Amino acid sequence: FLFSMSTGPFICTVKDNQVFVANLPWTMLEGDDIQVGKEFAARVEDCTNVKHDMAPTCTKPPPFCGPQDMKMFNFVGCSVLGNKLFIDQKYVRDLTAKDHAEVQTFREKIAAFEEQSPPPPPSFCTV
């Protein structure tokens, strides 16, 4: 398809200080949080690969995994997670009001297309 959407929680882990949420580079840990990232990452690997348990009671995601109920929108060319934009799996910027407007226009066009010339992806998916 040309669109998919979901609500958290998403899989969260850390590699080389980089926090990944839904496979996107959400934020990077510094200072006294670095070791916390290491412990968490270990916990995630143990929970997932050894216990075969992905429940938060096992993984215990720290607050740096972001809001556990944030929304994700996937378009052709880019994705929005929470209020952050990613292109080619790289953070671009925080969404602006205009960006949110494009998201709703796209959702409304996808709806139109469904009951129906598919909508083009939001302009922010380019460059």
Side-chain angles (χ1 to χ4, degrees):
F1 214 64
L2 63 193
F3 176 70
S4 77
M5 71 177 114
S6 51
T7 292
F10 297 111
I11 293 169
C12 182
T13 192
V14 185
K15 182 177 187 182
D16 294 323
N17 293 177
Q18 183 69 61
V19 184
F20 284 98
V21 181
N23 288 143
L24 297 177
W26 188 248
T27 193
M28 202 179 115
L29 306 184
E30 314 192 62
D32 301 332
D33 296 309
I34 292 174
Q35 194 52 38
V36 176
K38 292 187 190 307
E39 305 185 309
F40 171 50
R43 191 157 66 243
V44 175
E45 210 252 85
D46 181 74
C47 289
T48 306
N49 306 319
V50 183
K51 299 189 195 310
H52 290 340
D53 183 352
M54 293 170 71
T57 63
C58 189
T59 61
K60 296 173 185 172
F64 52 64
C65 285
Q68 297 300 287
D69 61 348
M70 67 179 155
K71 301 190 186 68
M72 178 170 190
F73 296 111
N74 305 297
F75 308 98
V76 171
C78 85
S79 299
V80 178
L81 177 68
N83 297 312
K84 298 183 186 186
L85 167 66
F86 302 80
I87 291 171
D88 282 306
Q89 269 87 291
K90 299 166 183 178
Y91 172 76
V92 179
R93 61 188 159 107
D94 287 346
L95 275 75
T96 56
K98 277 169 183 171
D99 295 331
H100 284 111
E102 286 206 81
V103 171
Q104 235 27 64
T105 291
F106 182 95
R107 297 173 77 189
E108 295 166 354
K109 281 192 174 180
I110 270 295
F113 182 64
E114 249 57 71
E115 174 180 35
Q116 195 181 66
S117 53
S123 64
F124 58 62
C125 271
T126 297
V127 103

